[PDB]
Write a protein that binds this ligand. Structure first.
Ligand SMILES: Nc1ncnc2c1ncn2[C@@H]1O[C@H](COP(=O)(O)CP(=O)(O)OP(=O)(O)O)[C@@H](O)[C@H]1O
Ligand SMILES: [Ca+2]
Ligand SMILES: [Cl-]
Ligand SMILES: [Cl-]
Ligand SMILES: [Mg+2]
Length: 375
C-alpha cells in the first residue's frame, strides 16, 4: 500500500544523507510535500526495500503522515552491464528503444487546481519553474489540460526538460519539454507507449521510438556521435540504457582511467556509472572504477558522520573546547584533514548538503592518501 511504500522509504533515510534522504518543500499554494531522493548508492543499497523507488517520488504530507503520492517519477534504472541488475540480460527481450534525451527530468503533480512540475529533488528548482512557465503558454494549453486530468486521475507525466541554457552534453536549440512516459502514482505501472501515441494532443511532445527485431542498435549506439543514446524498454516494462562512448567521454570530463583525481571527480559528479558501463568489456578498468567508488562511499559515510557527530555533540561549548574536541575526533581517526570542516560547522552550514559539498571538494585535495590499495 501507499503507507507501506512510505514506511520503507523513511526506513532508507535512517542511514545517512550520503545515501537515501528526503526533503520537505512548501508550494506557492502552501501545500506541504516530501520528496525522497538519493546522492550515492551502491548495488547493495539499491537492493534495499523499495530503494529503486527512492529517486524523486513525492508525497503530499500532513505533518509526518502521508496523504497521497503527489508525483511518481520513473524507478531508478541503469546502463547495460553497469551492475548485476543489468548483466545477463536477454537482449532479444528488448521490446523497443527510445531516444535518450539529454536534459533534466521534470514530473507532474497536482497542486490544488494547478498542474505543476517538479525536478528530481525539488518543486522550485530552476528547471521546475521554467517547466511550469512553458505549460502556462497558450501554445501548450491543450497539453496542460491533458496533464491536469491525468494528475487528477492519479498519473504522473514524466518529461525531459531541455534548453540551450540547460546544456549537459547535447546542444538543444530551444527550451522545451519532451514527454518520456506516464506512470500511475499508486501502482507504479506505466501507460503503454502505444496508448500515449494514440493521443494526437500528446504525440507532438512524445519522445521518439524505434522498433526493434535485433540487438544491432547497441553497438551502433556505442559508436555513434552527437547523441547520448537510448533507453530500452523490456517486454516486462523494465528499463536499461545505452550511452555512446562519445557522450560518456564528454560527460565523464577527461582521462578518468588514467588519473585518480579525475576518476574520483567522475564518481563525485555521479557519472562513474556511465564510465563503468563504458568499460564493461575491460574487466580491469571496470573493477578498478568500482574499487574507487567503494573507497569514496566508505570515506563519505565516515567523514560525514565524524563531522556532524562532533559538531552536534560539542556545538554548544566555547570555541577552544570545541576546537579541542574537533582536534580529538579528527586526529583520532586518521582524518586530520577534516579539522577545518569541523571548525566551520561551529557557525553552521546552510544545510547538511553544504557540509557534504565541502567534504567532497576537500576530498579531492587530499585524494592521494585514499587511492585504494593495489592501484
Ligand atoms: N526516453 C527516456 N526515457 C526515460 N528516461 C529518459 C529518457 N530520455 C531521457 N531520460 C533521462 O534519463 C535520466 C536517468 O538516466 P541518467 O541520465 O543516466 C541520470 P542517473 O545517473 O540514472 O540518476 P542520477 O543522475 O540522479 O545519479 C532520467 O531522469 C530522464 O530524465
Ligand atoms: Ca541525464
Ligand atoms: Cl510552486
Ligand atoms: Cl534527470
Ligand atoms: Mg549517473
Amino acid at each position: 500500500s501507499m503507507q507501506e511504500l512510505f514506511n520503507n522509504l523513511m526506513e532508507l533515510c535512517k542511514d545517512s544523507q550520503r545515501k537515501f534522504f528526503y526533503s520537505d518543500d512548501v508550494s506557492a499554494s502552501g501545500r506541504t510535500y516530501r520528496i525522497f531522493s538519493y546522492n550515492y548508492a551502491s548495488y547493495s543499497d539499491w537492493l534495499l526495500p523499495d530503494a529503486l523507488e527512492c529517486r524523486g517520488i513525492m508525497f503530499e504530507m500532513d505533518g509526518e503522515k502521508p496523504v497521497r503520492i503527489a508525483s511518481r517519477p520513473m524507478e531508478k534504472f541503469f546502463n547495460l552491464n553497469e551492475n548485476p541488475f543489468t548483466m545477463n540480460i536477454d537482449l532479444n527481450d528488448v521490446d523497443y528503444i527510445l531516444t535518450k534525451e539529454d536534459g533534466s527530468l521534470v514530473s507532474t503533480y497536482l497542486d490544488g487546481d494547478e498542474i505543476l512540475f517538479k525536478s528530481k529533488g525539488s518543486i522550485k528548482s530552476e528547471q521546475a519553474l521554467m517547466a511550469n512557465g512553458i505549460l502556462m503558454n497558450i501554445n501548450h494549453h491543450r497539453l496542460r489540460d491533458r496533464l491536469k486530468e491525468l494528475a487528477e486521475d492519479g498519473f504522473t507525466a514524466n518529461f525531459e526538460f531541455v534548453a540551450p541554457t540547460n546544456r549537459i552534453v547535447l546542444a538543444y536549440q530551444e527550451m522545451k519539454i519532451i514527454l518520456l512516459n506516464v506512470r500511475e502514482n499508486e501502482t507504479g505501472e506505466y501507460i503503454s507507449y502505444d496508448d500515449i501515441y494514440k493521443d494526437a494532443t500528446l504525440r507532438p511532445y512524445l519522445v521518439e521510438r524505434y522498433e526493434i527485431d535485433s540487438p544491432k542498435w547497441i553497438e551502433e549506439a556505442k559508436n555513434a556521435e552527437n547523441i547520448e543514446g537510448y533507453v530500452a524498454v523490456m517486454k516486462d516494462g523494465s528499463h536499461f540504457k545505452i550511452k555512446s562512448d562519445w557522450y560518456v567521454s564528454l560527460h565523464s570530463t577527461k582521462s578518468s582511467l588514467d588519473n585518480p583525481e579525475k576518476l574520483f571527480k567522475t564518481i563525485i559528479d555521479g557519472a562513474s556509472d556511465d564510465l563503468k558501463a563504458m568499460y564493461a568489456d575491460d574487466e580491469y578498468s571496470y573493477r578498478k572504477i568500482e574499487a574507487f567508488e567503494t573507497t569514496y562511499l566508505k570515506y563519505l559515510d565516515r567523514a560525514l558522520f565524524l563531522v556532524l557527530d562532533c559538531h552536534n555533540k560539542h556545538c554548544g561549548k566555547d570555541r577552544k573546547t570545541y576546537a579541542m574536541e574537533a582536534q580529538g575526533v579528527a586526529k583520532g581517526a586518521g582524518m586530520d584533514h577534516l579539522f577545518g570542516i569541523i571548525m566551520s560547522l561551529y557557525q553552521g552550514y546552510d544545510s547538511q548538503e553544504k557540509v557534504m559539498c565541502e567534504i567532497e571538494q576537500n576530498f579531492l585535495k587530499n585524494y592521494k592518501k585514499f587511492i585504494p590499495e593495489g592501484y
